[PDB]
Ligand binder design. Structure first.
Ligand SMILES: [Cl-]
Ligand SMILES: [Mg+2]
Lengths: 111, 235, 231, 240, 195, 250, 244, 243, 241
């Protein structure tokens, strides 16, 4: 039987400071007991001073990040180049994720 | 006969140009934008004295920060309002924020040219959309059935529009207060209306950052009408 | 006459009157100029206001970081077509990790406009577009007609009184094509070009709209006090 | 499917199909609505060109939409049935989802919305019907009376008439109906309604129907004899 | 839901329905009314899967109320039961069937007769002098078989019903928190507020 | 593309006439004469094989058609319209009847189905009416022998005897004088041949006349033996020789 | 394109009339006269076949009177083919109701349903209306004996006595003159035949030109019988009433 | 009358006037030609320089279908592009199912049936282009020309547009003077000349020459544009012949 | 007068668009002829190549529908090829569904039914073509069945189509009046083709070269067209007696 999901490992960490924020992640990508890559970037600058990482199944992680970056682009088109605030970005990502409620993006997302 | 989406030899859509004629027959609506808020006012124009005039709803809330006035075939506006409200609420659901006044207006205007042989004809109503957002402050837009929308410092639509617009040309300046705008709408409505203006055949409303969109009570408007009469008699 | 009731009807001389009437809507529109060098491509657009209380209708629309257009005619049609371009520019980036070539963008616009000229029920688009962009083969300028005809040019103008600007560019051809690595001088040439189409009115601070794209310059639009420098 | 745009604008900014639908309303039998202080009365004309009619089974002019709201009309009879059915379905749907019966304004707004939709939908003609919608909101004792027309505009009325010779009976109501003091009782309201129809009807026999709606779903139709007593009393006061 | 009983006597129909609503571990409510009035002289009690019961009952109610307004006429109990049976018979071959069992107690004003109809979720209809759904019949039918008479008064019906509930309370493992009892007769529907 | 003619092409004129139906009847009037006569023990339907060219093989053009083993049809008017109606009639006899009841439809009901198809071409979007009138003869156990006419409007009427097309008015008068309720099938065939001779100009023989009967069961035409209840079709098309034999006793 | 050829069957005239409905009514005015008369103990349906022939097989013929179920029948005036389309729909509606509620469909509910179908063809679809007027004669246990009529507009009304088709003005005046509320079926039979005899465009009224039916509680005890008269039975009732 | 107001209506002649009006749009277009040579085909087209502001060599008119077919057309340029887009879909589906690239006669009928389909209904307009197309397949070289009616035939030489009469006369000379055949390189030269000669009907404005070719020996049976030195050589040859 | 633009009845009960489609049939100015032998069916048609720039091998109005069935068309080539493609699809589908080769008369009926639909449905125009189908059917033998824009069809002993069909028809009629049989009593198809060409020459009064004619031949289990050199051999035999 075909299993649409996989586990690419990895670990990410977000910490909010007083006037700053960090989003960190290891650069290792794996399946089972093998290393795919020792440097595969996992944390991404998505524009509008927002950083994102979708950890877990890397194919779903890449798809989600790609669609969010795209959502930032179309937010600028549709709303006169307005900056997408972090709270608005968060609510938008909820809808991206829940859109596939019955076939989920197998990832744990942090922005 | 001929297509509903046909161009004239001058390069204008027949049906859109004809719907503009219907809007000219409509009751007057006026909007004035200031740095303290945007005012919206309408002529109610009841066809008979037995018609309860407070059931005439030509000024409408789209969201807390966006109001709307109409002129023309007002029945056509209902689906436009429904769409506007849905768009405002949907954007808040998707983005946890208020929608920009321009973006709301653009969303409404996207419906306009969706007619052919979709709906069977253009809308026979024009809208004045007034609101506030953090990026562009207090705004007033004129949404037409052509799908075009212009931003205005002040604008009049309906049967007394060109006379009213000439008056707005002379009266508007960038330092108008909200109170000055209220009286100005009342003054110009009184000028172009057939019947004598009072609190039962005219209606005022405004949108401010603090209190949002508010339709004025008949008692509140009646005081502003009395204040207008006295200041015109003052010289 | 008897053959202008719809777009599906040729005249006895082989003309499509509905398309020609759509073309007429562009001539009624406000003037907009396009011109390019080898490093940059510029759009200049005279915006039109309804009256003194009204705003000046926006003429320039961004399609991507490397592409955009200016419009003359029915503005809602320009929104439909520019939205389609945005989608096609986006499809190319997402699927092929590739910036959409300006020439291919022109081909797509042509084909979309064509379908509206051969089928019953529909109508032609009532707008003309000037598309500028910088891709893998340098700077480009396109002119779109709602007949479907798309043309790649060094410079051009569309709208009312566009013939004056078009003659100026035809004289200046050898000069402005050589304005490489100097964005300000290329815009100056575009502002001087659009000035040949003005009568009674002149270029003010809320009248003028300028856009530029180039080698190390994303598609950006200049309005308000950002164009006072060029007045 | 048939998609033809039948309702379209003309050079002078008129939609003729909507305007011709009003002409169908003008032809229809007169209907009148008058709200008192604690009731609303719907009066209807029955043309006496049709005798040998079976009045038991013949469709009555006033129709219950719910136990607390009624609808009368002027214009095409067959068209009115479609609006009545839709309204009745929407009334039960509202009770099912909101757990509260429709307000008179809501029901009016719905019917008016249906009428509007038929003025800018392809392949359909407008309803040749204007309606008077009357009743009382749930747990409310304020009388409600609304009017709709083919264009889809609607509004509230202290008193109103529609149909043939409605110009005449509106003339009567405008001089006889006082807003500061509406018909204080059922009797007064029914009397004023019968009086208004007698300006137009002909014989006061089986030509006048009267339906009284009171608060809390109290709706009753007056019989021939009951109405005949109003007709008798009105003319005996008139002989003076 | 759990216990629903019905008994047709001389001049009325009596429906008894439990008050408990249990969601697995806890009893969330002890005053639940598992019934809907379809028309002035027709009552329907119901039991089955959570959510589907009320959804179905209110759907049937809305439809009968619609019919009443359209025709200005109350359908006979037999007609209502036939409508309900068809809806359930339609439902059983659906994508997701209504898992709802009902009793329909009505007074036919034309025939001046009480009528009790039992319909399960498959659309199995039977007219009975007394009926039940689930395990309720297993405990009560032997008592009803013995004591029931077609000429019983409403008061005698209520007494025989009490005996049935007592036997249920004795031998059933589940605490159904008593029953709400309603009577359907020529004057309409009324609830017995002390039982 | 898409069929954008979703509106009726047949409409009421101010006078209350349905123009397209009237014009379809006009086309039927121009058509070659066909007739039908009902006897006590059978029905006969007949028409002229008006050959468009002498090089054409008129045997390949069937004006008289079997619809079911006990039902047959003939027409006057537009041949191609008739051909497609026969195809639809044969199919509907199976789909809306035989596949349900395991038996062929009675004459009146098959006629009813054909009539429905012709009515719909009179009201449906983007079509014209059928330019034919049909004469359908048949037998069934409970209704016995019957003969029906079906017009472009979809209207149908039962007849003892009738004629349609070119010389129908004269032919019907001829049939009124000869028809009685005691005719045997051979008498009806004889009258059919007499009547048809009046409207025929040129050659009058078995090769220029098409004639079929609904009569006794034909076990020789069944194609198999062994089932007592199956006794064979009642429809039988007369041969060129069989017609000529009866033209000597004419 | 196609718009050019569209008659626009569903539009108002400047006077607010439906062109096609009006023209369909004009068509129906040339159809054979059908009469319905309601009595206390039953209903009579009488109708004139249009200029027939001697070679028409009358005993197996039906163009006017149709059975919808055991309790309800209709008299037809207009296009027979259009009527049969509607009749079959009505028969199905009656059976749908019987299956759903296990009770025979009340007469008005059936009439409203058919009338709503007719209405639809006047408001949407761009098709021509049905050129048919019905007289519905039926019985149910709510209202008892009932007469209705419906026309191409989809409007229906209830009647004590009514005519449709040709010469309705003359026929309705004659019915209005001789009808009384306490009338019985045998009297109504006579009135119907007398009215047709006077309004007919034919020289004389004979059995072969008529279709006749009665709905009686003259069915043994508490039930209703439909009687579609045979040719010989129409001949006998013509002699009995003294018309031939 | 009124028979010419609607597409797919037969006039009393048995003519489709709307198709005939489409031809008028074709006759109004620039000149385009096709020459069948020994082992391939050559296509050429006149491009009118409306202004100095047109970028030279950029507004390409000739179009490739698959990798072995060239298409050129006169009349409404957008209509031609629409037809080529359909042609590309037809060629792709053919190759998808049958593996081999679509044969030229097969491809010709695909275009033909599609254009003919636009003469069957009043809901569509006929194509305002005549298309000259062809290439090399397993059976050799093929040249076709397709009209608004959907009519097409194979050709030795083909021409359409405003200067078609001039071009045809030139093509007829080549057919007569070369019964054995013409080489691919000769055909390119001759194509340049014929366009230059046909430019007398469009003499007001100057023009730009565009040539393409498919040849079994010269291009391996693939469609290619004539560029650089080979194009200049053909222009020089053409300019020498007009003087 | 929109009853002349679409396929609806005129007051005379006529369909003018069908009548005008019959007129389009003769737009090519080409005449065709078909005859039957003992073992074969032969069809001949005029070939005219008016332009020298044309490839004459591609100019044809005879089509190979299936292995057994051939079709010649009288009318414009776009409509001809439309009918050809459809007939090919219909013949292939028939074989797939019913497990045997589509008979000539059945295909003719099918194409006739399709034509009938265009005369009744308004959105579809008739095709301006007359289709002559030929084969040697496994049941009926040599077969000629012809279809027209009215949706009419019939079997033929022999037939002719075109501007000068009447002259050819009468010529053929007179021959069969003499012989008193329904076919050309000849063993080889070569001689049946010679008969066909000879009688067209007599009827039209014109001589033919190898490039002026187009010939199709149906035999048992195959239909095929003759090359210019095969026709030349035929013309030589005609001239030598
Ligand atoms: Cl078929
Ligand atoms: Mg047609």
């Amino acid at each position: 039987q075909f299993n649409p999901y996989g586990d690419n490992g990895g670990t990410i960490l977000g910490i909010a400071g007083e006037d700053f924020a960090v989003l960190a992640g290891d650069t290792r990508n794996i399946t089972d007991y093998s290393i795919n890559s020792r440097y595969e970037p996992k944390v991404f600058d998505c524009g509008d001073n927002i950083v994102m990482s979708a950890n877990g199944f890397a194919a779903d992680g890449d798809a989600l990040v790609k669609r969010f970056k795209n959502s930032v682009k179309w937010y600028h088109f549709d709303h006169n180049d307005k900056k997408l605030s972090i709270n608005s970005a968060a609510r938008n990502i909820q809808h991206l994720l829940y859109g596939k409620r019955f076939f989920p993006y197998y990832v744990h997302t942090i922005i | 006969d001929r297509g509903v989406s046909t161009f004239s030899p001058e390069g204008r859509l027949f049906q859109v140009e004809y719907s503009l004629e219907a809007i000219k027959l409509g009751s007057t609506a006026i909007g004035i934008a200031t740095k303290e808020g945007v005012v919206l006012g309408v002529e109610k124009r009841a066809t008979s004295p037995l018609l309860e005039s407070d059931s005439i709803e030509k000024i409408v809330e789209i969201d807390r920060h966006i109001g709307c006035a109409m002129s023309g075939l007002t029945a056509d506006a209902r689906s436009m309002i429904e769409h506007a409200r849905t768009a405002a609420v949907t954007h808040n659901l998707y983005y946890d924020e208020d929608i920009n006044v321009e973006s709301l207006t653009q969303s409404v205007c996207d419906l306009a040219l969706r007619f052919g042989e979709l709906m069977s004809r253009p809308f026979g109503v024009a809208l004045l959309i007034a609101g506030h957002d953090a990026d562009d402050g207090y705004q007033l837009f004129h949404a037409e059935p052509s799908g075009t929308f212009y931003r205005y410092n002040a604008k009049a639509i309906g049967s007394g529009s060109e006379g009213a617009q000439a008056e707005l040309l002379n009266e508007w300046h960038s330092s108008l207060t909200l109170k000055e705008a209220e009286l100005l709408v009342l003054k110009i409505l009184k000028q172009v209306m057939e019947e004598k203006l009072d609190e039962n055949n005219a209606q005022l409303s405004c949108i401010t950052k603090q209190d949002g969109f508010k339709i004025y009570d008949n008692e509140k408007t009646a005081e502003l009408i009395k204040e207008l009469k006295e200041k015109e008699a003052a010289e | 006459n008897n053959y202008d009731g719809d777009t599906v009807t040729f005249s006895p001389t082989g003309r499509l009157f509905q398309v020609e009437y759509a073309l007429e809507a562009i001539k009624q529109g406000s003037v907009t100029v396009g011109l390019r060098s080898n490093t940059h491509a510029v759009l200049v657009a005279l915006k039109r206001n309804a009256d003194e209380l009204s705003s000046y209708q926006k003429k320039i629309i961004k399609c991507d970081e490397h592409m955009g257009l200016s419009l003359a005619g029915l503005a809602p049609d320009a929104r439909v077509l520019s939205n389609y371009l945005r989608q096609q520019c986006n499809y190319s980036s997402l699927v092929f990790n590739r910036k959409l070539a300006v020439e291919r963008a022109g081909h797509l616009l042509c084909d979309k406009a064509q379908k509206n000229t051969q089928s019953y029920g529909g109508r032609p688009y009532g707008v003309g577009l000037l598309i500028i962009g910088y891709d893998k083969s340098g700077a480009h300028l396109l002119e779109f007609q709602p007949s479907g005809n798309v043309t790649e040019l060094y410079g051009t103008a569309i709208g009312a009184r566009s013939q004056g600007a078009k003659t100026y560019l035809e004289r200046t051809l050898d000069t402005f094509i050589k304005i490489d690595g100097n964005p300000d001088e290329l815009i100056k040439a575009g502002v001087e070009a659009i000035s040949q189409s003005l009568r009674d009115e002149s270029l003010t601070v809320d009248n003028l709209s300028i856009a530029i794209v180039g080698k190390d310059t994303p598609f950006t639009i200049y309005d308000g006090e950002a164009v006072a420098k060029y007045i | 499917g048939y998609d033809r745009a039948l309702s379209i604008f003309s050079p002078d900014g008129h939609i003729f199909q909507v305007e011709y639908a009003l002409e169908a309303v003008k032809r229809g039998t007169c209907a009148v609505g008058v709200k008192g202080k604690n009731c609303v009365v719907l009066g209807c004309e029955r043309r006496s060109t049709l005798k040998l009619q079976d009045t038991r089974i013949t469709p009555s002019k006033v129709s219950k939409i719910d136990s607390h709201v009624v609808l009368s009309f002027s214009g095409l009879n067959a068209d009115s049935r479609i609006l009545i059915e839709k309204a009745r379905v929407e009334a039960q749907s509202h009770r099912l989802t909101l757990e509260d019966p429709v307000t008179v304004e809501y029901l009016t707004r719905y019917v008016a919305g249906v009428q509007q939709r038929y003025t800018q939908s392809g392949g359909v003609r407008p309803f040749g019907v204007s309606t008077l919608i009357a009743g009382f909101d749930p747990r409310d004792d304020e009388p409600k009376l609304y009017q709709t027309e083919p264009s889809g505009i609607y509004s509230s009325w202290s008193a109103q008439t529609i149909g043939r010779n409605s110009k005449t009976v509106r003339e009567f109501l405008e001089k006889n109906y006082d807003r500061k003091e509406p018909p204080a009782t059922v009797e007064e309201c029914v009397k004023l309604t019968v009086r208004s129809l007698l300006e137009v009807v002909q014989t006061g026999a089986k030509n006048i129907e009267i339906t009284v709606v009171k608060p809390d779903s109290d709706i009753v139709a007056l019989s021939s004899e009951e109405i005949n007593q109003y007709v008798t009393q009105i003319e005996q006061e008139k002989q003076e | 839901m759990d216990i629903i009983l019905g008994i047709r006597v001389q001049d009325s129909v009596i429906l008894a329905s439990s008050k408990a609503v249990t969601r697995g571990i806890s009893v969330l409510k002890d005053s639940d009314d598992k019934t809907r009035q379809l028309s002035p002289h027709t009552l329907m009690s119901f039991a089955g899967e959570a959510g589907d019961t009320v959804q179905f009952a209110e759907y049937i109610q809305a439809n009968i109320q619609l019919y009443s307004i359209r025709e200005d006429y109350e359908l006979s109990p037999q007609a209502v039961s036939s409508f309900v049976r068809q809806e359930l018979a339609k439902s059983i071959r659906s994508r997701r069937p209504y898992q709802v069992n009902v009793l329909i107690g009505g007074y036919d004003k034309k025939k001046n007769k009480p009528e009790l109809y039992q319909i399960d979720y498959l659309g199995t209809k039977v007219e009975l002098p007394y009926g039940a759904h689930g395990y309720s019949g297993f405990y009560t039918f032997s008592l009803l078989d013995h004591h029931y008479r077609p000429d019983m008064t409403t008061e005698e019906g209520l007494d025989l019903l009490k005996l049935c509930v007592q036997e249920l309370e004795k031998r059933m493992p589940m605490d159904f928190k008593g029953v709400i009892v309603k009577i359907v007769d020529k004057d309409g529907i009324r609830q017995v507020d002390d039982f | 593309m898409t069929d954008r003619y979703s509106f009726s092409l047949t409409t009421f004129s101010p006078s209350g006439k349905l123009g397209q139906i009237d014009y379809a009847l006009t086309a039927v009037k121009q058509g070659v004469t066909s007739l039908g006569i009902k006897a006590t023990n059978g029905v006969v339907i007949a028409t002229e094989k008006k050959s468009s060219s002498p090089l054409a093989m008129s045997e390949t053009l069937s004006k008289v058609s079997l619809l079911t083993p006990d039902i047959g049809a003939v027409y006057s008017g537009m041949g191609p319209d008739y051909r497609v109606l026969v195809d639809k009639s044969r199919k509907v006899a199976h789909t809306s009847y035989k596949r349900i009841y395991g038996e062929y439809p009675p004459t009146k009901l098959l006629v009813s189905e054909v009539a429905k198809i012709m009515q719909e071409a009179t009201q449906s979007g983007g079509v014209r009416p059928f330019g034919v009138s049909l004469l359908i003869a048949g037998h069934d156990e409970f209704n016995g022998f019957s003969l029906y006419q079906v017009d472009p409007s979809g209207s149908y009427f039962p007849w003892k005897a009738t004629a349609i097309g070119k010389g129908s008015v004269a032919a019907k008068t001829f049939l009124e004088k000869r028809w009685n309720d005691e005719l045997e099938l051979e008498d009806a065939i004889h009258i059919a041949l007499l009547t048809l001779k009046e409207s025929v100009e040129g050659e009058f023989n078995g090769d220029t006349i098409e004639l079929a009967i609904i009569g006794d069961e034909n076990p020789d035409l069944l194609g198999y033996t062994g089932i007592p209840t199956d006794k064979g079709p009642r429809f039988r098309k007369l041969t060129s020789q069989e017609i000529n034999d009866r033209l000597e006793a004419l | 394109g196609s718009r050019r050829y569209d008659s626009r069957t569903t539009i108002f005239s400047p006077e607010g009339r439906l062109y096609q409905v009006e023209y369909a009514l004009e068509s129906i005015s040339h159809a054979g006269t059908a009469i319905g008369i309601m009595a206390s103990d039953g209903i009579v349906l009488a109708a004139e076949r249009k200029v027939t022939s001697t070679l028409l097989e009358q005993d197996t013929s039906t163009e006017k009177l149709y059975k919808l179920n055991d309790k309800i029948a209709v008299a037809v005036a207009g296009l027979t083919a259009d009527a049969e389309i509607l009749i079959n729909t009505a028969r199905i509606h009656a059976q749908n109701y019987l299956k759903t509620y296990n009770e025979d469909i009340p007469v008005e509910i059936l009439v409203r349903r058919l009338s709503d179908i007719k209405q639809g063809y006047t408001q949407h679809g761009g098709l021509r209306p049905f050129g048919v007027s019905f007289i519905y004669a039926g019985y149910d246990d709510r209202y008892g004996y009932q007469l209705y009529t419906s026309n191409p507009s989809g409007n229906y009304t209830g009647w004590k006595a009514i005519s449709v088709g040709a010469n309705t003005s003359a026929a309705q005046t004659l019915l209005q003159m001789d009808y009384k509320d306490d009338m019985k079926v045998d009297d109504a039979i006579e009135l119907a035949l007398k009215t047709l005899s006077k309004t007919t465009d034919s020289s004389a009224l004979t059995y072969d030109r008529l279709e006749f039916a009665t709905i009686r509680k003259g069915a043994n005890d508490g039930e209703v019988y439909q009687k579609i008269f045979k040719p010989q039975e129409i001949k006998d009732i013509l002699v009995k009433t003294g018309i031939t | 009358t009124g028979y010419d107001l609607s597409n797919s209506v037969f006039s009393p002649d048995g003519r489709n006037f709307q198709v005939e009006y489409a031809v008028k749009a074709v006759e109004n277009g620039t000149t385009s030609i096709g020459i069948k040579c020994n082992d391939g085909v050559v296509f050429a087209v006149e491009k009118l320089i409306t202004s100095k502001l047109l970028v030279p060599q950029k507004n390409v008119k000739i179009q490739v279908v698959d990798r072995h077919i060239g298409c050129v057309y006169s009349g409404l340029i957008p209509d031609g592009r629409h037809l080529v887009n359909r042609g590309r879909e037809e060629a792709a589906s053919f190759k998808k199912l049958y593996k081999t690239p679509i044969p030229i006669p097969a491809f010709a009928d695909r275009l033909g049936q599609y254009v003919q389909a636009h003469t069957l209904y009043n809901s569509v307009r006929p194509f305002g282009v005549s298309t000259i197309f062809g290439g090399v397949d397993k059976n050799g070289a093929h040249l076709y020309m397709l009209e608004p009616s959907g009519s097409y035939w194979g050709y030795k030489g083909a021409a359409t547009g405003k200067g078609r009469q001039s071009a045809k006369a030139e093509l007829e000379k080549l057919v007569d003077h070369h019964p054995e055949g013409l080489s691919a390189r000769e055909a390119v030269k001759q194509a340049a000349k014929i366009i230059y000669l046909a430019h007398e009907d469009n003499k007001e404005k100057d023009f730009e020459l565009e040539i393409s070719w498919c040849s079994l020996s010269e291009t391996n049976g693939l469609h290619k544009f004539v560029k650089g030195d080979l194009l200049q050589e053909a222009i020089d040859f053409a300019q020498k012949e007009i003087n | 007068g929109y009853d002349r633009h679409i396929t609806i009845f005129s007051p005379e009960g006529r369909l003018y668009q069908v009548e005008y489609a019959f007129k389009a049939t003769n737009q090519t100015n080409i005449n065709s002829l078909a005859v039957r032998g003992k073992d074969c069916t032969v069809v001949i048609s005029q070939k005219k190549v008016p332009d020298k720039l044309l490839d004459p091998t591609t100019v044809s109005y005879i089509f190979c529908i299936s292995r057994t069935i051939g079709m010649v068309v009288n009318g414009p080539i776009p409509d001809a090829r439309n009918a050809a493609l459809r007939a090919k699809a219909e013949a292939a589908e028939f074989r797939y569904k019913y497990g045997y080769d589509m008979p000539c008369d059945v295909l003719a009926k099918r194409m006739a039914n399709l034509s009938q639909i265009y005369t009744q449905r308004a959105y579809m125009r008739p095709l301006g073509v007359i289709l002559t189908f030929v084969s040697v059917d496994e049941e009926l033998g040599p077969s000629i069945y012809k279809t027209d824009p009215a949706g009419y069809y019939v079997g033929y002993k022999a037939t002719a189509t075109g501007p000068k069909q009447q002259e050819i028809t009468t010529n053929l009629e007179n021959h069969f009046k003499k012989s008193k049989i329904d076919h050309i009593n000849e063993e080889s198809w070569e001689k049946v083709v010679e008969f066909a060409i000879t009688h067209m020459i007599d009827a039209l009064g014109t001589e033919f070269s190898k490039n002026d004619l187009e010939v199709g031949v149906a035999t048992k289990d195959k239909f095929f067209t003759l090359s210019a050199e095969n026709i030349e051999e035929r013309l030589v035999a005609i001239a030598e007696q």
